Amino acid sequence: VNSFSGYLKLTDNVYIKNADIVEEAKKVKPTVVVNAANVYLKHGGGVAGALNKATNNAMQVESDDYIATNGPLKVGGSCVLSGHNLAKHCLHVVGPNVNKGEDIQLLKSAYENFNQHEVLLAPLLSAGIFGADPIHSLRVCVDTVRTNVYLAVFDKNLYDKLVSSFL
Numbered sequence: 001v002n003s004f005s006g007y008l009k010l011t012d013n014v015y016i017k018n019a020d021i022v023e024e025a026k027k028v029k030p031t032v033v034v035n036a037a038n039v040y041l042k043h044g045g046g047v048a049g050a051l052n053k054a055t056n057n058a059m060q061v062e063s064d065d066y067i068a069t070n071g072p073l074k075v076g077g078s079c080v081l082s083g084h085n086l087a088k089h090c091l092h093v094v095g096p097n098v099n100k101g102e103d104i105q106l107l108k109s110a111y112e113n114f115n116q117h118e119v120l121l122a123p124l125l126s127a128g129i130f131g132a133d134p135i136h137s138l139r140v141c142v143d144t145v146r147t148n149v150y151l152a153v154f155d156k157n158l159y160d161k162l163v164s165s166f167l
């Protein structure tokens, strides 16, 4: 049993809810919250900007030190950093950004990072301002992630379309 509440069960391991991931993280304090990161860990907008704002910019300060030491992530890659006030850990995962022309086949590689963690609170990778089709992102998630994933979908209209169209 875990603390996640109000989710619709899509599969054995994937759950979904219309929720603000920031508000969900603050309530649950999950072991892992996933950030929709870019390779520079520049948390300007979308999910990343919202998570970073909720940490009072501490996520960005930590991320800048990580990049200064290690250099940029790979598209499809990840790193584990602090979850600050939101979670124990933040798994920063880089899905491909269609608005930068990145290979959508890298979305499966991005979701494979989730398999290193038994339970996660996450957004749909490459959705929102990353430009991918969220229906596609949910299909790749279900077909790639084997660990238990709780997906937060900010937009109620999109949530209802994801559920209604789910195969």
Ligand SMILES: NC(=O)c1ccccc1O
Residues within 6 Å of the ligand: 020, 021, 022, 045, 046, 047, 050, 128, 154
């Ligand atoms: N998932 C989001 O994009 C988000 C979440 C909280 C506040 C602003 C936001 O844009």
